[PDB]
Design a protein around this nucleic acid. Structure first.
Lengths: 118, 78, 70, 82, 166, 184, 196, 49
RNA sequence: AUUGGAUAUGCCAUAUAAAGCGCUUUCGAAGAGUCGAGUUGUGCAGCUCUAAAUGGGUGGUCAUCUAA
RNA sequence: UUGACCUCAAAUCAGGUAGGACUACGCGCUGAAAAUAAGCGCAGGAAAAGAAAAUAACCAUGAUUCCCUCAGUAACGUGAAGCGGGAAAAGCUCAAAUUUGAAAUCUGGCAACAUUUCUUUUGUUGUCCGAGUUGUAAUUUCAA
């Protein structure tokens, strides 16, 4: 029962993180605070009946959904080069996760580079 | 769903060059003390004594096995 | 606000829309000499040419330079 | 084996799938001279290398590969697979 | 590329060629100083793959240590103390004999404009990278102190998480 | 005469090489090309020297001013140098003649070269000293040169030299390359 | 040549990567118990046990005893004849070794022991083959190197509750319960002739 | 110290070691000199060289 | 008084270029006195020996990962 | 007789850098009567770890760290980990393949021209010397 961890900074850690959320999105307004995560099945027998947020959409999920790896991280769609679709169920649950995302997305135009000649 | 091959699992198959580069070094470098002793025992056909010597040197049977056919093929090519 | 963001978005896409690019004076001559001698549609023949097609441009880029001329 | 093309080239002059394409490409463009042009032409070299791939695959241990490549117009046999 | 041949030739460490060179070279180094600078890597492929480029800023030193902790780990700390203005990138085994093991130690200059401007070794200029060898951050440091992903590899034990509303 | 520690190191090392039983792969790098063929090899090579960084600029400015005012060539013919570049060329069988510096410091670099050039059937020779091969390419040192293709004008000279390297380097020795050097 | 002074019975011992300390002691104790057995370093493969036949031929061993440790807690003992022969795979638990002071039996090393087999061994056709193979392996061959002609130990094999209770006698300390699972007609593989 | 034995190099290997084709780099005029030339022209136009 | 990042607009711009994705009658290099075996000191380390290429590691013939 | 290099020196050579302090937290190493204290080395505003030579045995998960839970369980009085819930999220770079129709690369000297938290800071352009072919750029990193 030596050195103790005492949580008197729990209420101030609650606000420190709230202000960090406030500081972050204020820097990147139009875009959401967080990325979209996929929906994945937990890897056990106690938990395979539930759905939970994944780490990102695999290469094939984005390929069928219509975004390539390079343009999918710009618009905020994390990729997961580890995860892979072993069954058509997970493919369809996450392909139509990006479908609703790409419908609700307003990609603002950037600045182009136009050389004087061709 | 069948899945396309992940290119990491391709590892260790072989190459036409990496095999060729390994063949040249085998000839150029020569042979280690123990490989010289093992090779002589094959020429004298004391193979059972030869193979048991290899396992003592390397440590495992498959490693000892694999080196034997490397040297025997070298013998036939020579 | 969401409606305002939408019309602002499609506005800028309209202002910066002309992604088409012209041909520099070199290219203007470069594709003209190829088309003045290999007809206009035989993009496989121009690619195989060794003298006029010095840069060894593939057929896909030859059409790209063609449509870019108009 | 290293003079098959030369006989056809001479006979055609006297009586004037990919392998068929390779023959036409050289005939339109036209032994060291033949080997020089192919090694100096990019489009022609691709056809010639393809032609040897088809002929060797179509035909195994009997044919002299080095002479076969000389027939097509290459200095040495290319690193064709089978 | 020759670096393919060299690497497959450095595997056979007792063949006729390697044995001659080991005894010939281990004699050379033992006449030279214990920590002596090399004008070039004695293994231009192993140094190559560990982060050495033939360009100004990259420094090779050779060091022998008696046999009988980790020898590679001592090779870092002894040279890192010898060239005290230089960062320790990696190191490798070059030769051994019945008493010594010889290593070469790759060092870079944080103060060199050819290093401070190339964005693949800019990182080691940073202050956090002072004396990596003295803190177990080289490859032999991370391997030795168990740093490794897997099941094979204090205060979380002997504290009390005495929360507020317990 | 108390020698410096490094003079003693240089000379003892030289004596050591001639005394030990050198392996055959390192023994071949002591019996090299003769002197008459060496100057003849470099007589040709000094025709195909790559242009210096001084010439490569003075030439490229001429094109730039031609473009800048108002404005195509033939393949540049020169000698191929660099260990990785040359080793690739032999394997790709694009090299007509390989010249190997006799005294490369870590001998690991070229010890496999005579075997590889023999394997691909590329006529090779072990020319004396790297600094000779260095000056051909405008460098301090070259571990290996290789002639890959020469103009038709000098095609006859190269063929004449290649038959000499065959007769003077590979026809001679050959068997002596398979004996352990040193032991003297 | 092929063999000088060929003993009647020869054995080989193999060990697993993942055997606990208590599993290690059991192999060490039995190895010293059997003078006709030769100890060898570990075999890497987990399911490729066919390599044992080539090793036994290399060492001129007639019987192969592979100690396999599953999940780093159990111990599966497999015994098979050198040339073809039936392979018996069993899980050995309830093991006591010489590191237990509960048994204070003492005997000279290498002494040929007397085997007492229960009548239940011959009752079943499958158990009859196991009893004969165990008797042949446990029996110290005549003229074996380092063997002792005198006999001072007795080994009792009994079939009770489907588990063989290994008893050596005053008890020596080695007491294990082996549960025979499968008997394969081949050596470490092939067709299956019996199942648990 | 036995005599050198060549159990691999006693024969000459006719095919090239690599199977990959020749990229069009080695038949077209250099692109790298083109970057240099166009940068050289630009300095001339802008009055640097 | 210094500044962060966007926005509008002007002037230059090497675009003879560079990049993503369809397709393949082509190929796919992958880290050694290190893995590892024997023993010793408390996973790592010392000594003795010393590897391979669908190979190697780790799990339960399959799965999973691709160290130095 | 003259020169290439290779290795090795010397200089109050041109320009640089290291040391000592603080040490609450960091990373090592050494170590008692707890992997503790003391000792020793080394850093930063955080350090370390970190984009799987990872789990699992599923309908599978997917860098690291941290919190809760797992759990005083498992294994052997010591004392886990995966899964589960959360906080935060970001990915990447080399070596190994010929730029070979062109070392395309970089330090430095001088000369200019700008810029500046700043006359103190930071560069660009030209030009000469060198570095470098025993390999500096472009390209590629297995997800390919």
């Amino acid at each position: 029962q030596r050195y103790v961890k005492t949580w008197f900074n729990q209420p101030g850690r609650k606000l420190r993180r709230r202000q960090a959320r406030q500081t972050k999105a204020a820097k990147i307004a139009p875009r959401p605070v967080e990325a979209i995560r996929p929906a994945v099945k937990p890897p056990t027998i106690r938990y395979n009946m539930k759905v939970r947020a994944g780490r990102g959409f695999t290469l094939e999920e984005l390929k069928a959904a219509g975004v390539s790896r390079r343009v999918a991280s710009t618009i905020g769609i994390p990729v997961d080069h580890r995860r892979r679709n072993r069954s058509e169920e997970s493919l369809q649950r996450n392909v139509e996760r990006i479908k609703v995302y790409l419908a609700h997305l307003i990609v603002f135009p950037r600045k182009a580079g136009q050389p004087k000649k061709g | 769903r069948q899945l396309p091959e992940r290119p990491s699992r391709r590892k260790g198959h072989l190459s036409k060059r990496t095999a060729f580069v390994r063949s040249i070094v085998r000839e150029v470098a020569g042979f280690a003390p123990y490989e010289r002793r093992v090779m002589e025992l094959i020429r004298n056909s004391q193979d059972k004594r030869a193979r048991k010597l290899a396992k003592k040197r390397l440590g495992t049977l498959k490693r000892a096995k694999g080196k034997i056919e490397e040297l025997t093929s070298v013998i036939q090519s020579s | 606000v969401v409606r305002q963001l939408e019309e602002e978005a499609v506005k800028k896409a309209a202002r910066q829309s002309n992604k088409m690019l012209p041909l520099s004076a070199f290219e203007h001559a470069y594709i003209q000499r190829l088309i003045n001698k290999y007809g206009t549609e035989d993009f496989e023949s121009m690619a195989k040419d060794v003298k006029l097609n010095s840069k060894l441009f593939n057929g896909s880029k030859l059409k790209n330079l063609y449509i870019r001329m108009k | 084996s290293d003079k098959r093309f030369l006989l056809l080239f001479s006979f055609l002059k006297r009586n004037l799938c990919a392998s068929v394409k390779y023959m036409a490409e050289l005939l339109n463009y036209i032994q060291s001279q033949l080997e020089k042009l192919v090694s100096k032409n990019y489009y022609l070299q691709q056809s010639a290398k393809d032609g040897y791939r088809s002929y060797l695959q179509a035909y195994i241990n009997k044919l002299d590969l080095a002479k076969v490549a000389k027939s097509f117009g290459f200095a040495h046999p290319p690193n064709v697979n089978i | 590329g020759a670096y393919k041949y060299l690497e497959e030739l450095a595997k056979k460490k007792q063949s006729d060629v390697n044995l001659f060179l080991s005894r010939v070279r281990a004699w050379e180094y033992r006449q030279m100083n214990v920590i002596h600078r090399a004008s070039r890597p004695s293994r231009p492929d192993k140094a190559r793959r560990l982060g050495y480029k033939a360009k100004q800023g990259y420094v090779i030193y050779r060091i022998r240590v008696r046999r009988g902790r980790s020898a590679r780990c001592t090779a870092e700390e002894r040279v890192g103390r010898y060239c005290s203005n230089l960062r320790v990138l990696n190191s490798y085994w070059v030769n051994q004999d019945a008493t010594y093991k010889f290593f070469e130690v790759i060092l870079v200059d944080p103060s060199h404009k050819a290093i401070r401007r190339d964005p693949r070794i800019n990182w080691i200029v940073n202050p956090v990278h002072k004396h990596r060898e003295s803190r177990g951050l080289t490859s032999i440091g991370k391997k030795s102190r168990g740093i490794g992903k897997g099941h094979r590899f204090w205060l979380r034990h002997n504290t009390l998480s005495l929360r507020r509303y317990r | 005469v108390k020698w410096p520690e490094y003079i003693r190191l240089q000379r003892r090392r030289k004596i050591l090489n001639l005394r030990l039983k050198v392996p055959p792969a390192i023994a071949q790098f002591q019996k090299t090309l003769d002197k008459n063929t060496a100057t003849q090899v470099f007589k040709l090579l000094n025709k195909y020297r790559p242009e210096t960084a001084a010439e490569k600029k003075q030439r490229l400015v001429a094109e730039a001013e031609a473009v800048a005012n108002g404005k195509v060539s033939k393949k540049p013919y020169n000698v191929k140098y660099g260990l990785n570049h040359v080793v690739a060329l032999i394997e790709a069988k694009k090299a007509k003649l390989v010249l190997i510096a006799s005294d490369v410091d870590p001998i690991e670099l070229v010890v496999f070269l005579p075997a590889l050039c023999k394997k691909m059937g590329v006529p090779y020779a072990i020319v004396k000293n790297k600094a000779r091969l260095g000056t051909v390419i405008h460098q301090k040192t070259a571990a290996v040169l290789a002639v890959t293709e020469v103009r038709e004008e000098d095609k006859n000279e190269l063929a004449s030299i290649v038959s000499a390297v065959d007769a003077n380097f590979s026809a001679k020795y050959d068997e002596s390359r398979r004996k352990w050097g040193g032991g003297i | 040549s092929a063999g000088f002074v060929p003993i009647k019975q020869k054995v080989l011992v193999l060990s697993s990567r993942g055997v606990t300390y208590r599993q290690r002691h059991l192999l060490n104790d039995l190895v010293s118990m059997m003078p006709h057995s030769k100890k060898d370093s570990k075999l890497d493969s987990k399911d490729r046990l066919y390599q044992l036949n080539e090793l036994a031929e290399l060492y001129n061993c007639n019987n192969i005893f592979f100690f396999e440790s599953r999940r780093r807690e159990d111990l599966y003992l497999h015994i098979a004849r050198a040339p073809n022969g039936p392979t018996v795979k069993f899980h050995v638990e309830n093991l006591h070794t010489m590191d237990e002071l509960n048994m204070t039996g003492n005997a000279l090393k290498g002494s040929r022991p007397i085997l007492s087999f229960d009548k239940t061994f011959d009752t079943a056709p499958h158990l009859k083959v196991v009893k004969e193979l165990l008797q042949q392996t446990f029996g110290i061959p005549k003229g074996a190197r380092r063997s002792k002609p005198f006999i001072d130990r007795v080994c009792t094999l009994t079939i009770a509750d489907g588990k063989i209770w290994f008893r050596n006698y005053i008890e020596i300390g080695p007491r294990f319960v082996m549960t025979i699972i499968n008997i394969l007609e081949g050596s470490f593989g092939g067709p299956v002739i019996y199942k648990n | 110290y036995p005599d050198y034995d060549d159990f691999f190099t006693n024969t000459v290997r006719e095919t090239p070691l690599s199977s990959a084709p020749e990229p069009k780099r080695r038949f077209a005029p250099s692109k790298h000199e083109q970057k240099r030339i166009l940068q050289l022209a630009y300095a001339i136009r802008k009055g640097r060289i």
